[PDB]
Scaffold this active site. Structure first.
Site, PDB file in Angstrom:
ATOM      1  N   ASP A 130       0.806  -1.208   0.000  1.00 25.59           N
ATOM      2  CA  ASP A 130       0.000   0.000   0.000  1.00 25.59           C
ATOM      3  C   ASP A 130       0.854   1.280   0.000  1.00 25.59           C
ATOM      4  O   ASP A 130       0.777   2.124   0.888  1.00 25.59           O
ATOM      5  CB  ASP A 130      -0.980  -0.048   1.171  1.00 25.59           C
ATOM      6  CG  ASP A 130      -2.102   0.954   1.039  1.00 25.59           C
ATOM      7  OD1 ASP A 130      -2.785   1.184   2.049  1.00 25.59           O
ATOM      8  OD2 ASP A 130      -2.293   1.517  -0.056  1.00 25.59           O
ATOM      9  N   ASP A 157      -6.396  -9.791   5.690  1.00 31.97           N
ATOM     10  CA  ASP A 157      -7.616 -10.570   5.485  1.00 31.97           C
ATOM     11  C   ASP A 157      -8.844  -9.947   6.142  1.00 31.97           C
ATOM     12  O   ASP A 157      -9.893  -9.838   5.512  1.00 31.97           O
ATOM     13  CB  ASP A 157      -7.448 -12.013   5.983  1.00 31.97           C
ATOM     14  CG  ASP A 157      -6.418 -12.810   5.178  1.00 31.97           C
ATOM     15  OD1 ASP A 157      -5.892 -12.313   4.141  1.00 31.97           O
ATOM     16  OD2 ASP A 157      -6.144 -13.957   5.596  1.00 31.97           O
TER      17      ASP A 157
HETATM   18  N1  LIG Z   1       2.272   7.871  12.671  1.00 28.23           N
HETATM   19  C1  LIG Z   1       1.635   9.046  12.254  1.00 28.23           C
HETATM   20  N2  LIG Z   1       2.090  10.263  12.606  1.00 28.23           N
HETATM   21  C2  LIG Z   1       1.473  11.370  12.198  1.00 28.23           C
HETATM   22  N3  LIG Z   1       0.389  11.339  11.435  1.00 28.23           N
HETATM   23  C3  LIG Z   1      -0.143  10.169  11.032  1.00 28.23           C
HETATM   24  C4  LIG Z   1       0.474   8.973  11.438  1.00 28.23           C
HETATM   25  N4  LIG Z   1      -0.253   7.958  10.907  1.00 28.23           N
HETATM   26  C5  LIG Z   1      -1.247   8.417  10.234  1.00 28.23           C
HETATM   27  N5  LIG Z   1      -1.221   9.775  10.268  1.00 28.23           N
HETATM   28  C6  LIG Z   1      -2.203  10.633   9.617  1.00 28.23           C
HETATM   29  O1  LIG Z   1      -3.454   9.915   9.658  1.00 28.23           O
HETATM   30  C7  LIG Z   1      -4.064  10.014   8.345  1.00 28.23           C
HETATM   31  C8  LIG Z   1      -4.969   8.815   8.051  1.00 28.23           C
HETATM   32  O2  LIG Z   1      -4.204   7.626   8.170  1.00 28.23           O
HETATM   33  P1  LIG Z   1      -4.801   6.216   7.708  1.00 28.23           P
HETATM   34  O3  LIG Z   1      -5.911   5.738   8.753  1.00 28.23           O
HETATM   35  O4  LIG Z   1      -3.758   5.162   7.621  1.00 28.23           O
HETATM   36  O5  LIG Z   1      -5.410   6.512   6.266  1.00 28.23           O
HETATM   37  P2  LIG Z   1      -4.798   7.083   4.902  1.00 28.23           P
HETATM   38  O6  LIG Z   1      -3.382   6.333   4.733  1.00 28.23           O
HETATM   39  O7  LIG Z   1      -4.626   8.545   4.963  1.00 28.23           O
HETATM   40  N6  LIG Z   1      -5.844   6.811   3.615  1.00 28.23           N
HETATM   41  P3  LIG Z   1      -6.323   5.213   3.400  1.00 28.23           P
HETATM   42  O8  LIG Z   1      -5.131   4.340   2.765  1.00 28.23           O
HETATM   43  O9  LIG Z   1      -7.585   5.279   2.400  1.00 28.23           O
HETATM   44  O10 LIG Z   1      -6.722   4.549   4.670  1.00 28.23           O
HETATM   45  C9  LIG Z   1      -2.884  10.030   7.358  1.00 28.23           C
HETATM   46  O11 LIG Z   1      -3.258  10.687   6.138  1.00 28.23           O
HETATM   47  C10 LIG Z   1      -1.856  10.867   8.130  1.00 28.23           C
HETATM   48  O12 LIG Z   1      -2.066  12.229   7.762  1.00 28.23           O
HETATM   49  O1  LIG Z   2      -2.937   0.602   8.776  1.00 31.01           O
HETATM   50  C1  LIG Z   2      -2.958  -0.148   7.808  1.00 31.01           C
HETATM   51  N1  LIG Z   2      -3.591   0.231   6.710  1.00 31.01           N
HETATM   52  O2  LIG Z   2      -4.152   1.477   6.706  1.00 31.01           O
HETATM   53  C2  LIG Z   2      -5.568   1.625   6.485  1.00 31.01           C
HETATM   54  C3  LIG Z   2      -6.308   1.692   7.818  1.00 31.01           C
HETATM   55  O3  LIG Z   2      -6.606   3.049   8.146  1.00 31.01           O
HETATM   56  C4  LIG Z   2      -2.382  -1.541   7.889  1.00 31.01           C
HETATM   57  C5  LIG Z   2      -2.869  -2.462   6.977  1.00 31.01           C
HETATM   58  C6  LIG Z   2      -2.413  -3.768   7.019  1.00 31.01           C
HETATM   59  N2  LIG Z   2      -1.513  -4.164   7.928  1.00 31.01           N
HETATM   60  C7  LIG Z   2      -0.984  -5.384   8.128  1.00 31.01           C
HETATM   61  N3  LIG Z   2      -0.135  -5.350   9.171  1.00 31.01           N
HETATM   62  C8  LIG Z   2      -0.136  -4.084   9.660  1.00 31.01           C
HETATM   63  C9  LIG Z   2      -1.037  -3.303   8.849  1.00 31.01           C
HETATM   64  C10 LIG Z   2      -1.445  -1.951   8.850  1.00 31.01           C
HETATM   65  N4  LIG Z   2      -1.003  -1.027   9.766  1.00 31.01           N
HETATM   66  C11 LIG Z   2       0.275  -0.697  10.127  1.00 31.01           C
HETATM   67  C12 LIG Z   2       1.384  -1.387   9.653  1.00 31.01           C
HETATM   68  C13 LIG Z   2       2.661  -1.030  10.054  1.00 31.01           C
HETATM   69  C14 LIG Z   2       2.855   0.019  10.950  1.00 31.01           C
HETATM   70  C15 LIG Z   2       4.266   0.332  11.325  1.00 31.01           C
HETATM   71  C16 LIG Z   2       4.457   0.694  12.791  1.00 31.01           C
HETATM   72  C17 LIG Z   2       4.406   1.796  11.738  1.00 31.01           C
HETATM   73  C18 LIG Z   2       1.753   0.732  11.436  1.00 31.01           C
HETATM   74  C19 LIG Z   2       0.461   0.361  11.017  1.00 31.01           C
HETATM   75  F1  LIG Z   2      -0.636   1.013  11.465  1.00 31.01           F
END
Ligand SMILES: Nc1ncnc2c1ncn2[C@@H]1O[C@H](COP(=O)(O)OP(=O)(O)NP(=O)(O)O)[C@@H](O)[C@H]1O
Ligand SMILES: O=C(NOCCO)c1ccn2cncc2c1Nc1ccc(C2CC2)cc1F
Ligand SMILES: [Mg+2]
Length: 289
Positions: A130, A157
């Site tokens: 991703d 999954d």
């Molecule tokens: N570790 C982090 N530190 C700071 N900001 C974060 C972090 N993780 C996520 N974010 C913010 O949280 C937002 C949403 O995260 P996430 O729930 O993973 O969805 P997304 O990657 O933006 N889009 P999607 O792939 O459709 O889920 C991201 O766009 C970042 O701006």
């Molecule tokens: O968050 C995810 N998709 O994003 C969409 C959900 O908003 C996903 C998906 C599948 N995954 C399978 N295993 C982990 C994850 C996983 N999350 C994730 C993975 C690695 C890290 C590293 C410590 C930084 C943080 C995470 F949050």
């Protein structure tokens, strides 16, 4: 030290997207500021323990190009992943404020994504699954790190899309994919960041001069799969960068470049040499430091 729900305190919401919401939180016992991602899942306690168990490899995913892990646990219909807070946010955010990201900056990003993928692949036999701008995070020390990669098979999954895909043609077409598919995602992410918008469909000549309705689901997927891949426009980007993405965006995944090749590509070698104040550029454009 173990992490649990009552040892945390919400500070603000960092964002959310498709299945997850992440908060900026304080871990009271340690004093640490973390990013806590909650994933709502209706699932039995058996598969929960497997997800938590599978996430534990994050404890050994240590790289300057990989977002740090604090710990993972389950609360109430939510699985929690606690990670390093990146105070720069994700690249899709910086892209908004920036309009476009300079090629030299994208040089540094490319290096980071490649080393991160390589790290997960060489050290953990993990593919990202991703790659796109919101899963590339940055901070005020000028570090560029990947997150949200596929460490837990079972978590994937339990979650198995949006109105724009960074998925390769082969992954859209079936099950016949693997690590190569991440290269494509990177390539597509780099155009876009470079150009200032999701590069499908490609801009008309008029749309180009200006910079320098939304497409329906099937029309977009059908384009990715059957139409020639996106290109950096000429003139405005070095020939090196152009070749670099063209290599990432070859439809045939076996002819598409791999991490090995990209790492020794002209654009990378050139970017490695370049002295770029990324920390400075980042803070200037998103107004931080
Ligand atoms: N570790 C982090 N530190 C700071 N900001 C974060 C972090 N993780 C996520 N974010 C913010 O949280 C937002 C949403 O995260 P996430 O729930 O993973 O969805 P997304 O990657 O933006 N889009 P999607 O792939 O459709 O889920 C991201 O766009 C970042 O701006
Ligand atoms: O968050 C995810 N998709 O994003 C969409 C959900 O908003 C996903 C998906 C599948 N995954 C399978 N295993 C982990 C994850 C996983 N999350 C994730 C993975 C690695 C890290 C590293 C410590 C930084 C943080 C995470 F949050
Ligand atoms: Mg994300």
């Amino acid at each position: 030290m173990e992490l649990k729900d009552d040892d945390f305190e919400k500070i603000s919401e960092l964002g959310a997207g498709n299945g997850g919401v992440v908060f900026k939180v304080s871990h009271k016992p340690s004093g640490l500021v973390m990013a806590r991602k909650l994933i709502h899942l209706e699932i039995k306690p058996a598969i929960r323990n497997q997800i938590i168990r599978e996430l534990q490899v994050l404890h050994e995913c240590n790289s300057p190009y990989i977002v740090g892990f604090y710990g993972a646990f389950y609360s109430d219909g939510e699985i929690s992943i606690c990670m390093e807070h990146m105070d720069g946010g994700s690249l899709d955010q910086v892209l908004k404020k920036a309009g476009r990201i300079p090629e030299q900056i994208l040089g540094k990003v490319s290096i980071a994504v490649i080393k991160g993928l390589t790290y997960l692949r060489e050290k953990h036999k993990i593919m990202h699954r991703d790659v796109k701008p919101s899963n590339i995070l940055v901070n005020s020390r000028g570090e560029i790190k990947l997150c949200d990669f596929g460490v837990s098979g079972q978590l994937i999954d339990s979650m198995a899309v949006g109105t724009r895909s960074y998925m390769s043609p082969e992954r859209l077409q079936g099950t016949h994919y693997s690590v190569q598919s991440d290269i494509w995602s990177m390539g597509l992410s780099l155009v876009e960041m470079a150009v200032g918008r999701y590069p499908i469909p490609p801009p008309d000549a008029k749309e180009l001069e200006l910079m320098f309705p939304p497409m329906a689901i099937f029309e977009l997927l059908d384009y990715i799969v059957n139409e020639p891949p996106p290109k950096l426009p000429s003139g405005v980007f070095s020939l090196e960068f152009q070749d670099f993405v063209n290599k990432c965006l070859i439809k045939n995944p076996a002819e598409r470049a791999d991490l090995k090749q990209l790492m020794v590509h002209a654009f990378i070698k050139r970017s490695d040499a370049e002295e770029v104040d990324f920390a400075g550029w980042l803070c200037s454009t998103i107004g931080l430091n």
